[PDB]
């Protein structure tokens, strides 16, 4: 019937965790697609590609985390298909980064709704889990991407390819 | 009258912290009893005993933590007697572990009610304290114990003593 | 209009973050004033002064943290004047420490109201941010100051200067 | 029209590389599903789970490799959806391992057909790429899984849970 | 009926070991209560608190030792409730230390009666066990506490709080 | 009446030291405001922000130095409010740097007037103090800022955002 370890875990919490798992997996797929878009010889921005590939591994980690939680709280995982990304040819580093920002805002909205739920089903554990392991990472992600979009713009992207080249070398070539 | 450092600390929060202190102490007493049950020469499962003794020290730490919080927020401690454990002869490693799971679920329920309170008396500090120092530890504890019960069962406990022996050597003989 | 990274950040949250920034800056100014009060040759309590100077740097850090959050969540900073401290001549180590306790209780009250808000505007990120980076630090601060006031009193402050001297050497001369 | 770096890369080779990319991603999804099946508290086989999680990361690496090749030879990637695994509840370690063997045999068959192609479209580079980076890994994988199935069987799986427990400790607890 | 390892262990010896176990646990509870009495912000004597907390851990060790002996000699443990301490508000460091001395004298009297028994039931093992693991520790404990009471008195406790403060810094701030 | 350590310290010297303290604090506030202006996601110049934040800490140090001198020479500190910066939105790195130059020239003018005073009230100690701890630092500051303004201009600021980006990476990304 129910697992020996289930307790205060509501069914809406569970379904939302499966949906969120599928979502994070989706984000990883998107970031992968963008990554190898910038690996293409007619784009050739190694640091853009490394960057998005890192983001893709991070998303995969987020999903696996959520699955570990599902099993943890006594819930049951159910995997769904992983929707192909909306694009196969992202136009530029700037455009890829804007799509990034929109994606991260999506995932953040989903996580905020999930926290609303865990709070309404009076599930504190799930609440503070979402808080400490996802929310801040989502704010930091959205911030980083916003700064990148701002700089790419102030430089003259996507008009000037010199811009995206320099941004690739001087911003994505060191740090996180 | 009231301590110089009291602030936003409600009286129900306080009484609940004293009750929770007594509860954690109780859990330590139980874990001790089980520990030295498995030290008995007619049981002789050194790793079961070490395991539960560790859990007992951990519970003692939880209590002392809660007392430090009471003094912290301006509350006053009041100690109550420590009820002897429901059993003096736990039947098997499997049964001891099941009683463990039930106990941890009790303590978790109490902590969740306490968080409900700290949230209703609009005490955020107490809320996130409960969250970060107890709730996750309680989920992890319940999970670990549930996995152990599952394995002891799948092996053939308590019917086969060979089982409990092997579980003692291969699962409780390394790790946490 | 609105920043690319804004999301679930309410305007009351923002104004409250600017007010809190100004408040933390104020606390730093106060702690500075007290510090160099105890640097005066007619007071001459090097450890009291070092202590309050440390507290002042800490407050400055709190403010800068809050500004980083404002920019983070898509809000906009607005700096206000920094009100001079209520006193230019704090009477004794004991009195300075009591004013300290009152100040920390003020800042704590403000932070608790801000958390109430972030919870009412359903802003979990801001909620748990306040929780993990400020609330506990505020409880610990109020506790430390309360203990100090208690000891200074039990010793005979401010009546006996021998007291404040000894407290300066044996309590503020080692540790945090 | 065509990339500056394309050369001797046939269109069937390309489409087959996109199909193979999607396939490897699928295998990673399957291995993930199995992994966290064995993380469930009513299964509780940490080493089975770690094992399949490793296999999942490996599959992800295989896919990313194939994408790097696509971009390398002048081809263009096209991502497709990732089909959910045929099962959400794998019965036992033994059954999960048998499904594993069948999957690896599928992927191997696909890779062998792809090598047949690269040989028929006289694409040596693609031929020896498939050879050195995939074929041997596929034989080794199928062998390992076959040995595991053989041992789980000879032990008495899935009938005896004691078996799967021991296999989990003594075979999946050390080595690769 | 009787354990395979029982030998020369009399029933009065056993009951006395269970009573002594409960007693040592009681002493640990008392020392804990005193400890966190001195953690209270209106007392604020960190070293008094650390001291009594150490004593509490030591008492817990004494109890666990006695349980290990019970199981050792073929006896059976029976746990009883742990009586709350006679006080919830110990007046001063001096008074807490006097209550300490009285407690240690109680425990010593009990242990001496137990040795009388082990000698009358001609149980040498139990006799020299009590001798080497408890009696000296009890004399040293009573001595230490007596010296502390003497110094607190000669200083002017509990009248002068300056006294207890200094004693806290200069005697309980270093050594055991 | 007057401090035991006062000597050759004129009252105009004192009032000027309090005014200068308030001024340095003001400069720190300004530099802070600029710093977190460049932390804004729609500006996003991490190195500009780090730079001005460093300058802000430096100014705070200057103030604390002056307070230490006041107490040193037998004077008495009097703290005044800290005027909010003239701007909340500095336009560009170039404009922020120009406002910087103007500010440093202000502080330098004030310090030069203060040295004129210490020389007219025949206060050599104060004279050479101002000389060795402030004047050179002020010339170096004004020089550095002037060079920065010159380079930002020669590059094409604020017209070209590419400029400010590059200046941020190649000039503010290494050194002081
Ligand atoms: O009275 C209510 N609804 O009708 C109510 C009471 C408490 C909360 C709350 O704790 N939100 O975080 C929300 C709604
Ligand atoms: O039958 C044939 N030609 O008439 C034939 C048979 C095998 C190959 C081959 O192995 N290519 O790699 C090529 C041609
Ligand atoms: Na939290
Ligand atoms: Na000079
Ligand atoms: Zn994510
Ligand atoms: Zn993300
Ligand atoms: Zn609520
Ligand atoms: Zn506990
Ligand atoms: Zn527990
Ligand atoms: Zn603060
Ligand atoms: Zn503070
Ligand atoms: Zn593969
Ligand atoms: Zn494979
Ligand atoms: Zn004892
Ligand atoms: Zn003792
Ligand atoms: Zn300056
Ligand atoms: Zn300056
Ligand atoms: Zn002259």
UniProtKB/Swiss-Prot annotation, chains A, B, C, D, E, F:
GO CC field: autolysosome; autophagosome; cytoplasm; cytosol; extracellular exosome; extracellular region; ferritin complex; ficolin-1-rich granule lumen
The organism's place on the tree of life at top rank: Eukaryota
Source species: Homo sapiens
Biological-process GO terms, alphabetical: immune response; intracellular iron ion homeostasis; iron ion transport; negative regulation of cell population proliferation; negative regulation of ferroptosis; negative regulation of fibroblast proliferation
Effect after changing residue 24 to A: Reduces iron binding and oxidation rate
Chief location of this protein within or outside the cell: cytoplasm
Site location (Essential for association with cargo receptor NCOA4): 19
Disorder cited: Hemochromatosis 5: A disorder of iron metabolism characterized by iron overload. Excess iron is deposited in a variety of organs leading to their failure, and resulting in serious illnesses including cirrhosis, hepatomas, diabetes, cardiomyopathy, arthritis, and hypogonadotropic hypogonadism. Severe effects of the disease usually do not appear until after decades of progressive iron loading.
Subunit structure: Oligomer of 24 subunits. There are two types of subunits: L (light) chain and H (heavy) chain. The major chain can be light or heavy, depending on the species and tissue type. In the human liver, the heavy chain is predominant. The functional molecule forms a roughly spherical shell with a diameter of 12 nm and contains a central cavity into which the insoluble mineral iron core is deposited. Interacts with NCOA4; NCOA4 promotes targeting of the iron-binding ferritin complex to autolysosomes following starvation or iron depletion.
Compartments reported by the entry: Cytoplasm; Lysosome; Cytoplasmic vesicle, Autophagosome
Residue ranges occupied by any Ferritin-like diiron domain in the UniProt entry: 7-156
Family from the record: Belongs to the ferritin family.
Entry binding sites for Fe cation 1: 24, 59, 62
Keywords from the named record: Acetylation, Cytoplasm, Cytoplasmic vesicle, Iron, Iron storage, Lysosome, Metal-binding, Neurodegeneration, Oxidoreductase, Phosphoprotein
Protein name, UniProt field: Ferritin heavy chain
Enzyme Commission designation: 1.16.3.1
Reported function: Stores iron in a soluble, non-toxic, readily available form. Important for iron homeostasis. Has ferroxidase activity. Iron is taken up in the ferrous form and deposited as ferric hydroxides after oxidation. Also plays a role in delivery of iron to cells. Mediates iron uptake in capsule cells of the developing kidney. Delivery to lysosomes is mediated by the cargo receptor NCOA4 for autophagic degradation and release of iron.
Broad enzyme group: oxidoreductase
Pfam families: Ferritin
Residues that hold Fe cation 2 according to the record: 59, 104, 138
